[PDB]
Assembly symmetry: D2
Homo-oligomer: 237 residues x 4
């Protein structure tokens, strides 16, 4: 069983699993059933930006999702990540479609992690930035339907050759290196992730979402995690 901590941008309300009745962002700790949610005015066909941040002093995971000239959506949850995640993790982007669909296009993605130790007071750090993705992107582990390099973008779910999204699709990109996301003797450990995304559907009703996640390093897409499970979780519990 994978251990997953995620920020979801959920375009599709599954109220039978506790989604609120509108598109929303959410903080998920080991369950697709978010611990905290906020209303999110998703705009179909427009480029937005997400930002996720955490530090071990406040022990607060927070995210803001925004479109230019619009009010942002923000959500926050108090959680000690060293009580949840293993010491080493991978970081990644997940998306999915079900019986409804949307393109789940990533235009850019960056991540910074820092860990300062208490025995020495010295820092380890990891930064990456993709402002474009190439066809053979060897520092990403591409899972399920994820492909890269079409127009320099990362397409987490299937897009047909005429530009339309496909239903029942699930794809992830994980950064190739493990990340040391906490250490018992860190005075302060932090991270921040940013990604710009383009969710478009010719349907009145898009689905299902894109999430930023942190997992056990050996994580894979759970069996049948298309749809509301966002490529993250083996079931709806």
């Amino acid at each position: 069983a994978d251990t997953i901590v995620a920020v979801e941008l959920d375009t599709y309300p599954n109220t039978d699993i506790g989604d609120p009745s509108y598109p929303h962002i959410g903080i998920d700790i080991k369950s697709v059933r978010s611990k905290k949610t906020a209303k999110w005015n998703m705009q179909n066909g427009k480029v937005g930006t997400a930002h996720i941040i955490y530090n071990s002093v406040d022990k607060r995971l927070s995210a803001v999702v925004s479109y230019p000239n619009a009010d942002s959506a923000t959500v926050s949850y108090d959680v000690d990540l060293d009580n949840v995640l293993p010491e080493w993790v991978r970081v990644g982007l997940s998306a999915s479609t079900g019986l409804y669909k949307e393109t789940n296009t990533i235009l850019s993605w960056s991540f910074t992690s820092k860990l300062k130790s208490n025995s020495t007071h010295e820092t380890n750090a990891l930064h990456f930035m993709f402002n474009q993705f190439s066809k053979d992107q060897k520092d990403l582990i591409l899972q399920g339907d994820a492909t890269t390099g079409t127009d320099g973008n990362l397409e987490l779910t299937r897009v047909s050759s005429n530009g339309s999204p496909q239903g029942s699709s699930v794809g992830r990109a994980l950064f190739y290196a493990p990340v040391h996301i906490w250490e018992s003797s860190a005075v302060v450990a932090s991270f921040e992730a940013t990604f710009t995304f383009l969710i478009k559907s010719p349907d009145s009703h898009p689905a299902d979402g894109i999430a930023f996640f942190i997992s056990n390093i050996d994580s894979s897409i759970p069996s049948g995690s298309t749809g509301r499970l966002l490529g993250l979780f083996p079931d709806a519990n």
Copy 2:
């Protein structure tokens, strides 16, 4: 009068102006009477580290102070800094001694500030890092008794040639450029500051401490602000 936000490392309790009875760290919002404090076991003669963080999403100002292999002191305070500080500020370090005294040596100092705006979703950033200081540190504004370049360090308060700290002293160092700390159309604004410091005293009670601070751009040491007022405040209100 100046507008000051600060994290203080207060080595000397002045309980007649509301300090805790022990050496403490504190978050000071336009007053020397800290909005929040925590017990801090200052170690006479050991090099310690301080980290200060804040972001516009959680609107939480937090600091950790620690020495190698000791429990850290942490203090935090919910505060929207866009309601407190002008849009443009200077950042700095300050220290004083009074009738009791200590060296207030800075061995390094770094700072990072970022603003991502909401009309363009583009980010401005300022980073600086000092891991030694030179005799002529042209990018620092020294006030009061502050000097640099003695052993490559920043001495915030006055030290004799035989290395002994002096009483009734006060000294500040500000980074030279104004810093854009918030902006009305920013999706996320954040900063982080680190410094390493060395407080040594021949007295049984060292006084008075060291602060990291954020101020109006034209800020200067208030008249009479040696001792308990830390070079930051004009009175004890």
Copy 3:
């Protein structure tokens, strides 16, 4: 008398003072008569990118200027800046027009400087990034006709309210803090500068160009330096 090292993007050939016969980029060392030039195919009304790099092992000053899908222009020159510049400098952007004109619009400007010292092997750093400019950009020193905040851009030279550039104009923007560009006891010093620019003109001959520049700190626009002198030199010697 100022000391200027500059990379010029020279849009107007003044062959009577050594310019090649075509738009060109150049490295200037204390003279507007370039020590080295490369052919530059400036594209009217297109947003381009310029990159400037130097380090104190190579002692080589190099620049690349390009537009999306074109061949870049590159120019490199061998010079120890230890011998040319003072130890503390300001970095800047400058631009001018004379009888002929162009908008000299900067859309982004970044700069990183790093110094690692010989006695301690410790490391000082300055980084700034502007991806937009506001109306009151307090960490810029604005000289001559330079203004910021028009469309979130920096217009180095005078533009009418109707969008039209003006002749006989000169402007500059310097970063506010002095920069420690070399230190006698450095194992390696380096810097990198990036800006993006937009040069539009109604004229068959656009004039005069834009420059990234490094100067004595107290530098100012030399009297008469519009047009060919690019806001940098007192004369064409």
Copy 4:
């Protein structure tokens, strides 16, 4: 066979394979016989620093190795890495011993690589920093004898529990993620690596040295590459 680009810190002169008659630094392009070398006064039992840099514009690989308060050794060589390395590489540190020996202790290692592409003018970047190494260091592929976590250091070759180095030992540590060190449509690509090291020995001629290297991603320690081959090269050609 592997494709290797290295900067070597060669503490033992093997004059039969073309080493000069002293300890030296060298640039190795797919052969252990350096394309350029400089004399290097290795100091037995002192912590030194090495900095290596390159960019695609000058196309010059350069390195400085230094001890506090000593003259640095520097070496440089004009080489287009486009023409030598594949598009994706791994980066690492290698060391060896042979009949003579020495501890090959890494106390810190940093690396930064950037690509600006010419179709879009956007950058992809990778940065990593270790100031401490932990026992189970997941983002490093340790090959051969290399180990981590002893006093928070990376020991490239075998050292006994009593501090003494061992002969005929070879060990490498590779960062986990492949690095995109060039791309055909890049306006500029560059990198930088820094490491600090402690070579200590009971012998009068310590051996064999330490290298920072770049390789094909599936590179491993070639057969019998102890001693003078520095864990890099399958033979002396």
